[PDB]
Design a protein around this ligand. Structure first.
Ligand SMILES: NC(=O)c1ccc[n+]([C@@H]2O[C@H](COP(=O)([O-])OP(=O)(O)OC[C@H]3O[C@@H](n4cnc5c(N)ncnc54)[C@H](OP(=O)(O)O)[C@@H]3O)[C@@H](O)[C@H]2O)c1
Ligand SMILES: NC(=O)c1ccc[n+]([C@@H]2O[C@H](COP(=O)([O-])OP(=O)(O)OC[C@H]3O[C@@H](n4cnc5c(N)ncnc54)[C@H](OP(=O)(O)O)[C@@H]3O)[C@@H](O)[C@H]2O)c1
Ligand SMILES: C[As](C)(=O)[O-]
Ligand SMILES: C[As](C)(=O)[O-]
Lengths: 371, 371
């Protein structure tokens, strides 16, 4: 069986990949070899009921060179380090990555098979050996409205995101939780007392949120009870942040439309959600079609997207992070025409950023590479 | 000196108004009369160092009929009951309302004087006697980009909101806070153990958020750690919620363009913030102007709007609910041209929903009416 190496299997994304792989018995048709950046020699974990020897150093090129496929969830720093060194040896195996590091490489293909399988297979024949997961937000967007691009109905998409703390890292999720606790703690008794003044409570919660002893070390500002309309670094040439820039760059590379690119732009905002990224869309369509047809085109693209009817009770129950968290479902709703015209479509979607937005496309390309 | 009655002065919006009036000495040039729907006969609040006798009944038409101006923050059900009975007596004084009830009536003007003083002035001369504050998000939007409408540069605006808990009520803010506390408490110990599993932490928080005992009666769903992409009731004829519908309806009546409406549409989403409504805009301009000119036009409209440089550090410091809560500042940043073209402009704004979104416009028209 093909020898597959796993790097970053212990991380947050890695842990999700391991769990998903165990659920689908992905360890059956492959020989697993586990690496580490801090536990070399130690006893390798037990997945798929198998027993790898001891953890090998993720930096041992000779060891890696023996592998047919490398699946990494370690991070960009690691990849930019080892990858060039491994290729420099002549190694011709496959490199499956969850980090963005190699996404825009001329010899790398961004994978999201339920959306761009043709691009993938084509790359495979062509000799492409590097496959990278796409930006979580772009991935979730395409899993929700892929049918529209599939039908070549999209002229341009305007996006406003509602991104979870989890997308920034495990330490960021923990900071959000700490902030939420401190906010309630600041007015614990006042909340219990029905006679208390709501303005008195707000004043106290706002003061705590602005206090020096309020944990903001990771976001650079309060997230719980607030929001941050800026994610990643600035791009001086356009004014977009790197997260916003990915919409255009990655959507078109995933779909293979670099020759006739579709404008995808907007604002990415971080909010107090744990691990589900939500998005509001203003989709300018190339033609005016019945809303019911639009819905079917969307719902039939893949089996994970789930159209949520534009009803209050149903929306509150199905189109929220609280509902989607930990599932492979990609609900999209609030679908209707906008006032600008019949070609303007409104849509809101929610999706788990660690599954389709991270571990799932990786787990899937791997399965396709092996048995 | 004019006789002015105050209704709903005890609630959340009413309290902020009383606060602002006390700070601005708005009671000096008027004779205050306080009413109540539940505490008639009890001592009135002594704002402005002035002392009214006892609370009068807000349902006493004979007492109301004696006033020159009635200022109410009581609510739509109150107004819909009393306004008709009072006007039926032939009463011809001024009615200033914070509730949406009379907003779309032809004998009423939606007031936001920094934006439509001309409408207010024309209406007064025409005989209009009813002034109503506009929807909070619409008001906050115009305070931010009124300069573009002032120059007739706006073709249409696509909106995505991030609305706070207080926008729905004092009960809802309290529920949000209680929810936040419960979420952290579910993993209090794990959070202080730096070696604990993040996925274990998230599964526990999510489980709590999904527990029947999780307090969700006010929102009908979890808000803390999540979001609710639905505000108000559904309008079957367009697919919009009443909240979303107001963008087109109120923006245009405020601007006096109900005859030739500028399309303003989008999605209104509730998030876990206490009292600031934020909005992401995609503005289709009529002309292709340099970014710097657009900024000058936006900044020059009024003294409260504040253009925030498209810089990360400044944005995290100035463009957030944490910074603007309790202030009259209306920051607008992330200004840049979008990928769709040089006529497409992006912008993100944040504003306190209880000030410019509620009490401030009311407070201002009252001052105009009393002198
Ligand atoms: N966060 C998201 O929502 C998201 C979404 C899509 C893609 N990604 C990307 O996926 C890659 C990995 O992200 P991540 O958030 O999974 O990184 P992470 O949680 O920090 O894990 C990465 C590595 O940190 C090391 N580590 C040190 N202490 C650890 C501990 N106590 N528990 C677990 N691991 C520990 C592990 O390496 P050793 O075992 O060798 O020590 C682990 O492989 C990044 O490139 C990221 O950008 C993230
Ligand atoms: N919340 C916002 O951010 C916002 C923004 C824009 C517009 N508005 C609108 O402004 C109007 C009032 O909203 P609101 O949020 O201020 O309503 P509220 O807080 O419920 O106050 C309304 C009334 O409820 C009664 N009440 C019962 N128990 C009370 C208590 N424990 N404390 C204070 N009052 C109590 C009071 O009437 P009595 O004293 O007669 O008993 C009070 O005047 C509504 O039409 C609302 O839609 C609200
Ligand atoms: C969240 As990314 C750095 O994998 O585009
Ligand atoms: C903020 As309203 C409910 O008076 O449109």
């Amino acid at each position: 069986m093909k020898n597959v190496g796993f790097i970053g299997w212990r991380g947050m994304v890695g842990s999700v990949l391991m769990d998903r792989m165990s659920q689908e018995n992905d360890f059956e048709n492959l020989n697993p070899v586990f690496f580490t950046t801090s536990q070399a020699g130690q006893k390798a974990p037990v997945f798929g009921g198998k027993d790898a020897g001891d953890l090998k150093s993720a930096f041992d090129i000779e060891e890696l060179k023996k592998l047919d496929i490398i699946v990494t969830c370690q991070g960009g720093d690691y990849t930019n380090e080892v990858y060039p060194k491994l290729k420099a040896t002549g190694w011709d195996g496959y490199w499956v990555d969850a980090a963005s590091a190699l996404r825009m490489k001329d010899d790398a293909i961004i994978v999201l098979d339920p959306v761009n399988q043709h691009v993938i297979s084509e790359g495979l024949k062509k000799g492409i050996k590097t496959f990278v997961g796409g930006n979580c937000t772009v991935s979730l967007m395409l899993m929700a409205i892929g049918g529209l691009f599939e039908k070549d109905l999209v002229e341009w998409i305007s996006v406003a995101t509602y991104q979870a703390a989890s997308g920034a890292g495990a330490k960021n999720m923990r900071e959000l939780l700490s902030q939420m606790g401190l906010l309630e703690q600041a007015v614990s008794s006042e909340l219990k007392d029905p006679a208390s003044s709501i303005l008195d409570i707000e004043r106290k919660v706002t003061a705590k949120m602005r206090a020096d002893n309020f944990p903001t070390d990771n976001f650079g500002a309060a997230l719980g009870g607030s929001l941050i309309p800026w994610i990643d670094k600035l791009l001086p040439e356009t004014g977009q942040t790197k997260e916003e820039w990915k919409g255009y760059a990655e959507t078109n590379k995933i779909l293979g439309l670099s020759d006739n690119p579709i404008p995808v732009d907007g604002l990415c905002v971080r909010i107090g959600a744990l691990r589900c990224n939500s998005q509001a869309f203003t989709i300018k369509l190339k033609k005016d079609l019945p809303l019911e047809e639009i819905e079917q085109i969307i719902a039939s693209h893949n089996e994970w997207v789930k159209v949520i009817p534009n009803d209050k009770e149903i929306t509150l129950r199905e189109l929220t992070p609280a509902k989607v968290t930990g599932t492979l479902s990609v609900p999209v709703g609030r679908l209707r025409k906008l006032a600008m015209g019949p070609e303007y479509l409104a849509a809101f979607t929610v999706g788990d950023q660690l599954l389709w937005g991270a571990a799932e496309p990786v787990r899937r390309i791997l399965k396709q590479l092996v048995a």
